[PDB]
Design a protein around this nucleic acid. Structure first.
Ligand code: NA
Ligand code: NA
Length: 326
DNA sequence: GCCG
DNA sequence: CAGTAAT
DNA sequence: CGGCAGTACTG
């Protein structure tokens, strides 16, 4: 339970404003502080108490107190009038802050402006077509039906294929923004050439309705991001994201694709403090980095049969997927 | 924005 | 490459 | 000061 809703609600506004205007790192700082506040055991009632909490510094503390005393936040009143419009545009799949700001500068103010006048990438046109659907979450039960549709199609041409739904699904969420399907084969080799077979099968049953990201030219495709819809009435278009990985990469892929994103970043951050590196492919040791924290030497891949291995190798207690929201 |  | 995306 | 995660498409 959030014991500081009146605080975080207002900070969240300012946070999203920074995010759509492209101030990525300031927005990150806000997101951490906000999460810290959602998690504190009590109402925060003083400046000194606010500073005591990890993720909250003096600058955030001052804003917390201002809200606590005056019920308003001055910084809110002076947010650029463009921000609601920037948020509107940035919620088009395939458009980010740079495109949203360009569209705004060009005079566009509504999705109707975008449809009739804006230059749209192929992805952004699909995003616009499914604008509402892409902002909806589906019941986790529908995610199950989607995973089963992909699994049945995959296993139909290779029974050995393992398919698992990840992301918010695997973390136990009641609703899911998309379906993340990880596919591998416990024999190191068979997982090659399968995107082409899988996709053509899912198209032939009319399941896939649009492709957003799908490099099908050379058989080195690693991901599919697209759109599907189950049969029958009352069905919405749902985002479907599929990755196919070598078996030896299964645990790191499972871990990455399960998330959350913040959980991933925090775990990878920790790995870097230990001169290690964690990606969707592997956990590596003895990685060489320069003074800016940038990789200049590859390191060594560590064997990680299971998720518990990754945790173990990082000196971390295991955390079940449901406990990985942050 | 936070923090080492 | 810059932009956007995946978690 | 300056890092804030590590990856994969698009065009
Ligand atoms: Na977007
Ligand atoms: Na997801």
């Amino acid at each position: 339970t959030n014991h500081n809703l009146h605080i975080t609600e207002k900070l969240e506004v300012l946070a999203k404003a920074y995010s759509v205007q492209g101030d990525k790192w300031r927005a990150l700082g806000y997101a951490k502080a906000i999460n810290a506040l959602k998690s504190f055991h009590k109402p925060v009632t003083s400046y000194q108490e606010a500073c005591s909490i990890p993720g909250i510094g003096k600058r955030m503390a001052e804003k917390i107190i201002e809200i606590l005393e005056s019920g308003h936040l001055r910084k809110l009143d002076h947010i650029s009038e463009s921000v609601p419009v920037l948020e509107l545009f940035s919620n088009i799949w395939g458009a980010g802050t740079k495109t949203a700001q360009m569209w705004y500068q060009q005079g566009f103010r509504s999705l109707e402006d975008i449809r009739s006048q804006a230059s749209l990438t192929t992805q952004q046109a699909i995003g616009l077509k499914h604008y509402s659907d892409f902002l909806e979450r589906m019941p986790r039960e529908e995610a199950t039906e989607i995973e089963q549709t992909v699994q049945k199609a995959a296993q139909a041409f290779n029974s050995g294929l393992l398919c698992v739904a990840c992301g918010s699904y695997r973390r136990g969420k009641a609703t899911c923004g998309d379906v993340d399907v990880l596919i591998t084969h416990p024999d190191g080799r068979s997982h090659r050439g399968i995107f082409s077979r899988l996709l053509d099968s899912l198209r032939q049953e009319g399941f896939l309705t649009d492709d957003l990201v799908s490099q099908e030219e050379n058989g080195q495709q690693q991901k599919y991001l697209g759109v599907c819809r189950l049969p029958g009435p009352g069905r919405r278009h749902r985002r479907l994201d599929i990755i196919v990985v070598p078996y030896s990469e299964f645990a790191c892929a499972l871990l990455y694709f399960t998330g959350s994103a913040h959980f991933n970043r925090s775990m990878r951050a920790l790995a870097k403090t230990k001169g290690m590196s964690l990606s969707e492919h592997a956990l590596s040791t003895a990685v060489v980095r320069n003074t800016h924290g940038c990789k200049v030497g590859p390191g060594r891949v560590l064997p990680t049969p299971t998720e518990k291995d990754v945790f173990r190798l990082l000196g971390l207690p295991y955390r079940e997927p449901a406990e990985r929201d942050w």
